[PDB]
């Protein structure tokens, strides 16, 4: 039949899978890089961290947080990581 | 503007009739605005109490000033001369009340307690009436 297919180009957009779309420590959406890695011109190498109680944060943000307070910024449960981003 | 005619008319009206509990009100030799008052109740049966009366300018629309000169033990009367009467105060005054009505209202106020310018007197009169029947009894002859 007419109208065969010869060559195709595909475009897709990727984003993290999370119920919450904000860091809750900084005003940066989860799909964007954190402020520190923008200031240092990092090559987009900070990922998101999942807690036991299903919280999404930047790895940079909570890595800075954990030194002072060993609890979530939203609830006050003991923080042990479950799944690192990548 | 027309207070003097009001005061002369009221003086004529008081001169015409007469009252029992309220003895009479004076004028102090043509002062025409400073007036002297006297009342007698029936636990204050015996006594000729003395009052000081001041009429401000534009009297019917501005309440007068009322102070007793004779000391009396009353929860509604201060130590020196302050009496709590809403009619006398500007809160509940109307340009229709006369000095006669004011004086009879003061007499009725002397007749009964109204539980307040003195917390001690109100507290004494609240628990029992014996103190208000003894120290108020022995209050007009002396002090």
């Amino acid at each position: 039949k007419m109208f065969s297919l010869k060559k195709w180009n595909a475009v897709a957009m990727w984003s993290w899978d999370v119920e919450c779309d904000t860091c809750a420590i900084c005003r940066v959406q989860v799909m964007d890089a954190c402020l520190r890695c923008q200031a240092e011109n990092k090559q987009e190498d900070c990922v998101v961290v999942w807690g036991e109680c299903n919280h999404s944060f930047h790895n940079c943000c909570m890595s800075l947080w954990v030194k002072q307070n060993n609890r979530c910024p939203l609830c006050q449960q003991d923080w042990v990581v479950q799944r690192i981003g990548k | 503007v027309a207070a003097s005619s009001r005061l002369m008319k009221e003086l004529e009206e008081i001169r015409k009739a007469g009252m029992k509990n309220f003895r009479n009100i004076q004028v102090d030799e043509a002062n025409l605005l400073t007036w002297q008052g006297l009342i007698v109740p029936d636990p204050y049966d015996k006594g000729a109490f003395r009052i000081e009366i001041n009429f401000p300018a534009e009297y019917p629309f501005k309440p007068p000033k009322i102070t007793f000169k004779t000391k009396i033990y009353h929860p509604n009367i201060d130590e020196k001369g302050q009496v709590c009467l809403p009619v006398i105060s500007a809160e509940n005054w109307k340009p229709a009340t006369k000095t006669d009505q004011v004086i009879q209202s003061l007499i009725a106020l002397v007749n009964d307690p109204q539980p307040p310018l003195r917390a001690d007197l109100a507290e004494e009169y609240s628990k029992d009436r014996k103190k208000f029947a003894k120290n108020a009894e022995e209050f007009t002859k002396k002090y």
């Binding site: 923008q38 939203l74 | 501005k62 709590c84």
Partner: protein, 428 residues
């Protein structure tokens, strides 16, 4: 053509940002305010088929909200006029042809009366309105008879006053009362300033004037304060020289805050401006020490701990102009030494303004953080404040304590500082 309709296809129908502090206001003069007050009346007068005086008299009571007036009219068009102190209540009580004030039989060509039908002669009412106007009331004139809440229409008052100065005083007081009752309108604190601000919603946002450059909360009218709760910042200013005398021997009116004193005697205290009744014992209506220093040490320490930041960020506004002048001198020096041209050196001024705004907001964020909570929101608010403090000190080092400048780094840090300031001002 390849470049037609390119404006429509951009940013996925979303770009730029939204300012969390916007508030539309038009600054009107005295004549414009009078015209606006007149215009908001003829509509009601035409709808309700009543006179102008009664129209504004019922308008004043309900704070000039036309829609609520119309709804309440169609609900109960009798209680509407009764509530606004126009018609006598059906629960009132009643010789003929005798004035009860000056007490003389009088003819029939006089003895004016209101809808209450209480007769008083034209020789009277005049001293009454004169005494009231001189005392300084414009909307408080009422029937002389006892227990008559009726309020006098102004067309009934103007022919009574004898001279022109009294009429001028009455007009001024009436205008003040009208602009106080209206909800979209407000006066301007400051010096002699005949400017009235008109808004569209009554809220607590920053406003300005076009003749004296004054800034104030649209509610408290003292000083702009974004994160704080207006009354809370009033409390903070109170608890912090006439100040000692006022705080020791005065008090504030409950309904409309007015500084008053107790002349002496009695405890029943009545407000002479809003008629509210309260107690000078612990306020309220009429429907009713060992180790003390050790205990208060924590409170005093916390208060001074916040007051030091308050005072530093207050002194920053004082020594703002010197920073601006230093920036200008540095710019002029670099231009004169031929190290660039003028257009290349005006991001430093933007950085200075950014620092000023950040310092002002970080100043007013502390009373909120003190009167807030004992929970996680508290645990994070001053953490974000500390982050902003670190960024402010970094940028201040980079702009005023340095000579070599790189535009990219400064712009990036400016963006970061703005983001953190928005983070703090988020809950507003």
């Amino acid at each position: 053509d390849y470049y037609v309709g390119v404006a429509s296809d951009v940013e996925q129908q979303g770009a730029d940002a939204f300012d969390p502090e916007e508030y539309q206001f038009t600054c009107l003069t005295y004549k414009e305010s009078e015209g606006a007050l007149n215009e908001h009346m003829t509509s009601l007068a035409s709808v309700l088929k009543v006179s102008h005086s009664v129209a504004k008299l019922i308008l004043v009571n309900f704070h000039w909200q036309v829609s609520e007036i119309l709804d309440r009219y169609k609900s109960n068009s009798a209680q509407l006029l009764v509530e606004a102190r126009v018609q006598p209540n059906p629960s009132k009580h009643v010789p003929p042809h005798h004035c009860a004030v000056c007490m003389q039989f009088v003819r029939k060509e006089n003895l004016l009366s209101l809808a209450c039908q209480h007769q008083f002669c034209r020789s009277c009412w005049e001293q009454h309105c004169s005494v009231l106007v001189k005392d300084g009331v414009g909307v408080g004139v009422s029937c002389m008879a006892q227990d008559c809440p009726l309020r006098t229409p102004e067309d009934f008052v103007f022919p009574l006053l004898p001279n022109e100065e009294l009429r001028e005083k009455y007009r001024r007081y009436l205008f003040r009362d009208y602009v106080e009752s209206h909800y979209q309108l407000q006066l301007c604190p400051g010096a002699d300033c005949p400017m009235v601000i008109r808004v569209q919603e009554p809220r607590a946002r920053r406003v300005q004037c076009n003749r004296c450059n004054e800034v104030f909360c649209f509610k408290c009218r003292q000083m702009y304060h974004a994160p704080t709760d207006c009354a809370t910042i009033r409390k903070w200013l109170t608890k912090c020289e006439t100040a000692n005398y006022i705080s020791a021997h005065t008090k504030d009116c409950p309904k409309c805050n007015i500084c008053i004193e107790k002349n002496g005697g009695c405890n029943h205290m009545q407000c002479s401006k809003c008629k509210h009744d309260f107690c000078w014992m612990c306020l309220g209506d009429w429907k009713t020490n060992q180790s003390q220093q050790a205990q208060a040490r924590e409170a005093l320490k916390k208060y001074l701990f916040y007051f030091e930041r308050w005072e530093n960020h207050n002194k920053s506004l004082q020594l703002e102009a010197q920073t601006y002048q230093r920036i200008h001198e540095k710019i002029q020096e670099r231009v004169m030494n031929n190290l660039g041209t003028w257009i290349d050196w005006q991001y430093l001024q933007n950085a200075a303004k950014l620092l000023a705004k950040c310092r002002y907001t970080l100043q007013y964020t502390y009373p909120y953080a003190y009167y807030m909570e004992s929970g996680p929101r508290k645990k994070l608010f001053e953490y974000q404040q500390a982050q902003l403090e670190a960024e402010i000190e970094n940028l201040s080092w980079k702009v005023e304590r340095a000579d070599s400048y790189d535009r990219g780094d400064l712009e990036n840090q400016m963006h970061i500082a703005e983001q953190r300031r928005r983070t703090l001002l988020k809950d507003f």
